[PDB]
Every structure is written in structure tokens, then in C-alpha cells.
Design a protein around this ligand. Sequence first.
Ligand SMILES: [Mg+2]
Ligand SMILES: [Mg+2]
Ligand SMILES: [Mg+2]
Ligand SMILES: [Mg+2]
Ligand SMILES: [Mg+2]
Ligand SMILES: [Mg+2]
Ligand SMILES: [Zn+2]
Lengths: 98, 84, 24, 125, 206, 155, 127, 60
Amino acid sequence: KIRIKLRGFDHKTLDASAQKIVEAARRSGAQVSGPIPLPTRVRRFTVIRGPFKHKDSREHFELRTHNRLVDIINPNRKTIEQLMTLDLPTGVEIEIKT
Amino acid sequence: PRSLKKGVFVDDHLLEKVLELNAKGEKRLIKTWSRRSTIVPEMVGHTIAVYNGKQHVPVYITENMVGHKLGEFAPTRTYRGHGK
Amino acid sequence: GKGDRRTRRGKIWRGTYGKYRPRK
Amino acid sequence: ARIAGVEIPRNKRVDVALTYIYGIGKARAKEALEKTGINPATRVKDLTEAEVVRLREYVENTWKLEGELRAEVAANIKRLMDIGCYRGLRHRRGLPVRGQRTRTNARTRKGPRKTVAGKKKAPRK
Amino acid sequence: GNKIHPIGFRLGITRDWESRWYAGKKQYRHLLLEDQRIRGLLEKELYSAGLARVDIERAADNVAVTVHVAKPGVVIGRGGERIRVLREELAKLTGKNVALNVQEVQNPNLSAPLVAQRVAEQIERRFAVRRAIKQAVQRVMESGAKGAKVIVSGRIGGAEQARTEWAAQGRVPLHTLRANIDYGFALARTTYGVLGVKAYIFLGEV
Amino acid sequence: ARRRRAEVRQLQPDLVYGDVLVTAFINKIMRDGKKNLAARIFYDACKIIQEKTGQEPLKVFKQAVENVKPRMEVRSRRVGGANYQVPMEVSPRRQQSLALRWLVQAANQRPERRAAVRIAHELMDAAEGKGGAVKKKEDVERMAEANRAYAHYRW
Amino acid sequence: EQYYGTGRRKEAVARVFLRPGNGKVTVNGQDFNEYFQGLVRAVAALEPLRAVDALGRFDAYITVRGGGKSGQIDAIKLGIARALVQYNPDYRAKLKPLGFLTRDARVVERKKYGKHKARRAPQYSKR
Amino acid sequence: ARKALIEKAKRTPKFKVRAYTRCVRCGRARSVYRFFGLCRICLRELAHKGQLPGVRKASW
RNA sequence: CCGGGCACUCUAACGGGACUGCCCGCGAAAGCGGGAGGAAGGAGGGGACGACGUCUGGUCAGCAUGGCCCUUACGGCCUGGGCGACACACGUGCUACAAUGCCCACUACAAAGCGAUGCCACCCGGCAACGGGGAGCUAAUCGCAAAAAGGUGGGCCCAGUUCGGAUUGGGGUCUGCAACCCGACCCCAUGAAGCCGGAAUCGCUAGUAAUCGCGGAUCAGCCAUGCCGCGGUGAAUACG
Ligand SMILES: [Mg+2]
Ligand SMILES: [Mg+2]
Ligand SMILES: [Mg+2]
Ligand SMILES: [Mg+2]
Ligand SMILES: [Mg+2]
Ligand SMILES: [Mg+2]
Ligand SMILES: [Zn+2]
């Protein structure tokens, strides 16, 4: 009954990762609770375009943090064996907690 | 409608410095920069000189002005009118 | 109106709470 | 009903009429009527001699109103003024005493706007 | 005053970042400073080699760092002793225990960052700006490319009145958000002041 | 409007009489986009119109409108130099715009404290042939035709 | 048995479960005329029923979340218009000439920088 | 930015109310963003280069 | 709420969908008008994106950089004062001059954000700001939050008013080493001008204007009515 929470700036980097974590544990154990999206928190940065004056320049920036769930219930050694061994994504930070 | 709470602040520069004067007599003028100090009974009678940010001014502290922060009797701006 | 700090709206405006605008 | 120093509210609800006393308003008005049993909504006229007594009794004795109040305030303003006190100066000058800007909006304190000549050729905006 | 950075303009599309690492709302301003500190050295003790991009990945006290260069030999070192000096002198900036790499630039004529450097280089020496530009535009165009453009600013030729020399060939569609245009800028300290040098290289499209 | 000939917004009919001139009149009453409070004020007046009168509300409304519509108005125009107020027909479109606007404006000039009252009244007065509405309507028509001579500028 | 429509308006979604019955309406557990008390607009929400003559024929359960009640009225109006079609596809041919089956796409415009409100432009003095 | 004024780096301030910020990069102070430690100018520059991971151009 | 269920709403990733494709008319063609189907129609609505050049445009106080200039000081520390001064002039705004309103009560609809010495449920003390205690959340699963306008009821009765809150007196909370100069907030008292603004002048063509409330960055706290952004209700008018 392990709940995995994957997050990342790139949505495909997660879609990629998360997909693996599923296909993997989709054998050694349960078929997982399916990867779930979860709302995305978004950072905004509104910075005056040029230095000095021109208060009306602006330009908009944003740092979008995506999330996922997966959620694997019924861990069976190998279920955890397909995990700790195979890893890849760089822009993906994982959180496994049952 | 001023505010402070519980601790009516006073810079011990002149505080510990003023209570020592009481133990004896009254020292003519006591230049301070603790414009932020709250006036207290002890200070009464004394003569603390506060800085404008330019000069030290003689301020005879009275019993009816206790509580008012020091300075506040040492104006900063020098304004005599725009008239001409 | 929004100007009066001692009324419902006055508070809401100043975004405060108090006698005139209780935190429920 | 003469309830305070030569005070005399009338023909309106009492909780609104007590407001007409130099030391009372909404807050204190709603208090005195509360602790006097009178129903605010009653017109000063419709008040009962007895009610006018309880009301007047409290009000005049429970607070500092009218003339004496004015006297106090004024006494304070001279007080801090008779000592170097910043506020004191501000009062002598007749300029605001609560750290508001004086380069502009300070009319309510400065009184009528008294224009002067100036330096035109130069966008004073 | 106009024109968006051609790179920043297409990060979502045809153009990856130069630092790709997962979340971090309490350390972002630390890994970043680090990524910076890093590039600091690399864009110094690695200039003469064609420093054309310093990628960086991470994963819990583990930095990747992939210095792309036109002359890796200069990076590696005799037999391979410098790449060893880097790594060490490098972990002196940050513990972390960070890797390193040296992928080469297959043809620096198609590397805007480099082209900028070449032109800025000659200028620093004392070559004919206009020439330098025409030639570079050529090379870049000469070695493939579907378009190229170079822009030197400053006091061209030590002149007192700042100007701006042009030069471009083929297509350099800055608006078409997908063209895939490599951008590069190069400074140019001079006996008489700075000169900015911009290079645009158009490669394929889709 | 340099290019096209601006299309006239067609609004959804009244939710009581299923009429558009009502929605129209209702909007003119509305302020700060409070189309609800605006909606009441009218409907209430409609009742007052049917209490202080036996007539149906909606037909009294129609009457007011029809009586406030100016048929001629004067548009200024530089000619040779001076700006001659020039008389000319009023398009049925504008005729209505001016009517409903005037009704509301006149209504809010009235003294009754309650809004709905003012409208119910001004309208009834309009059907009668009085009230500020009609005064303007006629003051206008009078203004035009009073500047007759300056009409060979047909426009 | 039962019929349904989704209906959305300027950021309000309304699940409409049409059903055969009296003609009562339940919006968020409240009587239709209780959720929309004192809102002249209210009536509109059921206009698509009057179109093909229903109401006194159907009974509807309704979910509504997001926006304001004026927006919800409109969504509800879409959902109703939609379910109506499942019950009888042939309704379209007469339910559409009114456009009830159209999803009003009008929406709150983004607040642009530089201006005060997307469009409201700051004013200048003696330009 | 005076080298001298970048004393702020002195995690040794008589009282913490005196401790301010300053840009990590240009050494500015007028408008630094906590999440980055960079000023509004430095942030746009780095942002554009793609050196700010995950950061991008907001459009909508 | 619980078991349970993925249907619906939603969340987020991919994908379909509109091309004047289809019918009618004008046309040489492009295209124009009209019609059907469609959630949407002829660039469907809003963004990002700004040509070669223009102005000796702006910024050497963001940074960088040529030259000139100071190098017991044109460098550095500290304490205090000043950037907050006022007889005045202008720009941008806020609040308002009221009954389509003000007020008190009860009651209902939102989106986008933010949260570690952080957001703070709930309880208690206090008129209150806030204090003491204390659960939950590392945050679609807890909190900021109350949306306000609106709806139902009740008060005010045309008054400079139960309009409007300036100004001042008094008491107090919180931050911070410290709030005299120079913070914000609470409560009592005070309760100003203002009755819709001369010449002149500004914005906006639709989910726009107008009006209503909500969030964020910076940030100990805050002079924010500024700025960036979110959703609610929602017009008038365009002959030309
Ligand atoms: Mg009031
Ligand atoms: Mg809006
Ligand atoms: Mg600070
Ligand atoms: Mg110049
Ligand atoms: Mg200043
Ligand atoms: Mg336009
Ligand atoms: Zn910076």
C-alpha cells in the first residue's frame, strides 16, 4: 500500500517517468491505482522589461510544477525490486510513502 | 494615542548614566544620541542634551513631560516660512 | 462607506476585523 | 429632553439623539439606552419622564460630556504645547500633528488655499 | 528597443534549457547559484576550446555538467590530466561530488555561440569588422545552414560615432516560432570600448 | 465605425411581457450592471401603473415611448464658417434611443423619493402628454423647425 | 427512464438529470425557486422546456457549481436543452432555431498589463 | 553597487532587522526575488538564456 | 459521512474539430452577400510575437565598458538627522457628496493564488486589534476564506442626515534593538470639506465600459488607494 507522488517542471518528463513506475510494478504486484494527474501549482514572475523607468514594459514568466499519483497497493518484494533498481528521469523528483 | 505595550523603552546609555548622577548631584548637560529614549521620573530635574542630527540641544526635563520620548523636544527641520 | 473604518465595509476595505467586522 | 450640559435632543430616535451631545455618539448612545432599559427606537418626545430620568442620570454621571470635555481636550492641547513637544509645535503652527505629508493635502488643517505667484516656464507638473 | 531573445522565445518548442533539474522551492536559489558558480569557471578555465554550452543536470548532491566544445583535447589535457584538474578544483566550489563530461562540437561553423566568439575575437585583435562579419556569415552559410546573420555594434573600427554592421544570408525568420535558430552573443573588450557581437544560425525548421 | 455599418445589438425579450423595448427600457434604468435591481424598479412601476390606473402596464409604457419620440432634431454643422444648427429627420432607431433615455432621465428628475414611483408616474404623464420627457421631445422639435432656414443643408 | 445534459456558461457547470414527472425542479438540493429567489432572470433557465412543451411533463434534478447564479441559470439552460435532445433527438430541429444548444463562449477578458483592466486605459493629463 | 556595500553578506548584523537582500548576480537590491535570489533584471536575462530550469514565458 | 462506483463535474496529457468544405446568388479570378449543418464560421474570443529604420530617445545608480577625475580621502565604519520638510503649482489616484442609497441581521453563488519558525482550524480571555492554548497540512485531502455586489427582513425619511469620514483629544494591540522626527491596526470621543464640480480634458465598441469583491510579488512590520492578476453582475452607442 505504497503511494507514490511524482513532481516535475516538464510534463512529459513525468508522463514518461510515472508511466514506467506503473508498467514496472504492473507485473510484480497489483496493477497500481493508475497514474493520476493532480492540479498544477503555478509561479508567476512579472518583471519590467527594461532596466530603469518604463513601468509599462513587464514581460511575463512562470514556473509550472506538475504532479502525479500512481499509488501502488499490495507490494511484493519484486514489486519493490522493479523500483529501486530501475531509474532514469532527471527533471523528476519522487516521493514514495505508504 | 501612542503605543509601546509593556516595557516603556529607555536606552541604558543615559539610564544607567542618569541614576548614577542621582546618587550624587546634577551634571550640567548630558549629551545623548538616544533620541529614542522614554523620559522617566528620575530624568526629571536633569538636563539631557539631544542631537538634532546636527547639534546637541539643552533640554530641561520636567515632571509634566515624563513619558514623552527624548528628542521630540529636539526638532529636526529648520523651517521659518516661505514668505518673502 | 469604504472610507469609514468603523463599519462593516470600512473594515472589509481596510481588510481588517474588529468590533464592526467580527471574525464570525 | 435636556439630558446633558444645556443639551436637548428631540423628535428623533433616542439612540440617535444622544449623539447630539458633545461627548456622546453611537457607541456610548447604544450603551446608556441599554443600561437604562429604554428602547432606542422611541422618539425623544415619546420618552417617559421616568425614562428621561434614568437616561439623564446615567449619561451625566457615567461620563465626561459637553463643556467639561471641550475644556479637557483644550487643556491637553495647551499642555503638550507648553513643552517643546513636537505635537506642541505642530499645534502652534496649525499644521497636522500625526505625520501626514504637508507638501500637499493638508487643507483641512491649513485652512483655505492661499495661492502665491511662481516660476512658470518649467513643467511644474 | 525590441526583439525577444530568440532562444528564450522558443524554450517550450525547438529549444531545451541549459539546466534541467526537478523541483525545489527551498533550494532553487541555491542550486541555481551553484549552476552559476559552475558556469563561472567553465566560462574561463575553458575558453580556449570553444566553450559553446554548459548543460547541467542534478539529483541529490549529484551534478552532471556537460561542457560542449569544439576542441575537447584542450579540455581533457595531456593524456587526460586536466579534465582531472577541473573535476577536483571544481568540487572545491561545491562538495556535491560532481561528474563532468566533454562532448565535442561537430562543426563549430554551425554553432552561433562560437561564431560570435570568432568575430568578437578578430575584432579584439583588430580586423576589418565588415569583413569579419561577411566571412563568418559565409562560413556558417558555407557549412550547410539554411540562413545566418551577424551583428557587430559598438564603435566599429575605433570610430567615435558608434554604428552597427549588418550582414546576413538565407533565411533567419525570428518570428516563425519553430524555425530553430541558434543564437549567440559575444562581448569584445577593446582599447577603446566594448562591441557586442550577435550571431544567428538557422538550421532546418520543423 | 469607419468600415462596416455597425450591427444593432438584438437583446432578449422581457421575462414578463416578452418584449424587447422593455429590456431596452430596463437597461436604461440599470446602472453599474445591476440588471436585477433595474428589473424590479420597472416591474414594480408596472404594478403602480395598474393600480393608480386601470390600464394595462405594457400598453401605457408603449404609449409613453411613442409620445417622447422626437421626429426632428438639430445637428450642428460648420458651413462657410459658422456652425448652423441644422434641422433634419430622426431615424426610427435613434427616435427610440432618445425616447427611452429621456423617459429615464425625466423620471429621475421627479421628486417622489422611491425610484419605481418616479418611473410609473413619468410614464403615465408621458402617455398623457406631459412631464419632462415630452417637454424635451417638444423642446427639441421646437428647436428644429425653429432653425428651418438652415435646412437646405439637408445632410 | 432518465436523461442528462452538462451545460456550461461563463465558468459555471450544471448537471441536468431530466426525468419524467410532475414538473418540480431541484437545484443543489433546493427547490428551483428557492435557490433562485428574487432573481427576475431565473425563469430563463427552463425556457428550453417551454420550447417543446415539457416541465409539466418532466421533472429535473440539477447540479450546479462555479461562477454566479446568473451564469448558473444559463448553464442549467444548456443542460436542460441538451438532455431534451437525448429524450427525443427530433427536438433539435425545433430546439436549435432558438440556439439553446449553443454554448455561449463569452468570457472574462484577461487583465493586460499597462492598462487598468484589459482595456480600461490609464488616463493622461495635458498630453 | 559598491563592493563595500555588499557587507550584507556579513551574516553578522547587530540586529536582524538590518539584514536585507541584494541580488546574487548583479548585486542589486531594489527588486530581488526570494525564490531566485536574483533581481528583476538578472532574472529576465538568465530566464531568457534558459538557465532558469522550468522557468519560461507565461502566455494566456 | 461510511461501504462502494467510476458514470457525471473536475483534474491533466494526448487527440479530434472549421477548410469558404457544403447549398444559393454576384464574380474573370481572388473574393463578397446569404443559407445549412455545427459548441464554434469565414482571422470564433484573448495572449506571446513587433520589419529596415526613426529620435544625438532612456539608462554609465542594475550590470558591463573607453576616457577623465579622488586615492587619509570624491574610499570605509558608526550614531543621529534627511530622502516624510511647506505659502504655494501640476500629474495619477482613493473616498464621497447619498434613498437605483446608508445601516444591522439572516441567507447564497467564484476564480486565481499563497503557506516552516509558515498558513493557522477549534477553545478560552478581551468591546476589539490581539493574547494564551492547541488540531491539521509539507498542502486537489489542512489553513488563509469572509467572496462582495446579490436574495429575505428590519431600521433611517431627504436632513449636510443613521449621507461623508477629514481633523484632533484619549486609551491600547502587534512588528521590530528601537516606531519623537517617521509604522500599521483596534476601541471611545471628535466629525471637517463635500449637494456632483469653470475654461479645459480622459477611458472604453462586449462579457468591453461601469460596478463588486478575491489573490500575489516585495515584505519584520508598513504608509498598497500603487502594480500584476482572478472571478461575480453586466449595459449604452456607432448615421457617418
Ligand atoms: Mg457612515
Ligand atoms: Mg472584471
Ligand atoms: Mg527590511
Ligand atoms: Mg541625449
Ligand atoms: Mg521620495
Ligand atoms: Mg478597438
Ligand atoms: Zn541582479
